Structure 1
């Protein structure tokens, strides 16, 4: 019973949601570059997407917020969407690499 949210709890929340376009969770896809969580429980994540072509991006990103906001302590929701760097398709599971073709 406590109110100090962490990178652990944020990862564990996001482990529910799915990127429709891929069929796995973001933590599995390895998109969260960095995760800082202030002591005012400002949950603050460098994430991005595989690509800016994502189909219903605004719904996927809204459901990412849906997980993040549930964490009973999550004062505010600083989801950074860093849209410049190349991600890496290999960040997915080894079985998904062989599946997709990477």
Structure 2
């Protein structure tokens, strides 16, 4: 547009970040619930993890945020961590439900 980031870009930016445990990106894992961007390019996301575990959780949070702040428009970054709801293991490719055993 001019200086107006969108959820479309935020997803496609996040497709870069791959969790060294899993070997897929967060859009592949389908994690991301909401994505809203204000007129002030406050990129806000309701992204969550699968589990409150991970192998290096904090680093993975910061890696998603890394891709998000690399959008060159992304003035501010309102990364919530909504851990309350049950994510969904079938969000991944169906090939990987076969692979992992879901």
Relative to the length of structure 2, the TM-score reads 0.96
1:41-98 deviations in whole A, cap 9, x for unaligned?
A: 0000001100001110111111101100011110100111001110110000011111
User: Once superposed, which parts of structure 1, at least 4 consecutive aligned residues long, lie more than 6 Å away?
Assistant: none
Where 1:50 maps in the other structure, the secondary structure is coil
Q: CA deviation at 1:2?
A: 2.1
Where 2:74 maps in the other structure, the secondary structure is coil
Q: CA deviation at 1:3?
A: 0.8
The CA distance in 2 between the partners of 1:21 and 1:49, in whole Å, is 13
- Report the number of matched residues: 102
Where 1:10 maps in the other structure, the secondary structure is helix
Structure 2 residue ranges without an equivalent (≥5): none
Relative to the length of structure 1, the TM-score reads 0.96
The CA distance in 2 between the partners of 1:82 and 1:96, in whole Å, is 24
The CA distance in 2 between the partners of 1:10 and 1:2, in whole Å, is 16
Could you say which residue in structure 2 is the equivalent of 1:32? 32
CA RMSD of aligned residues (A): 1.0
Q: CA deviation at 1:14?
A: 0.4
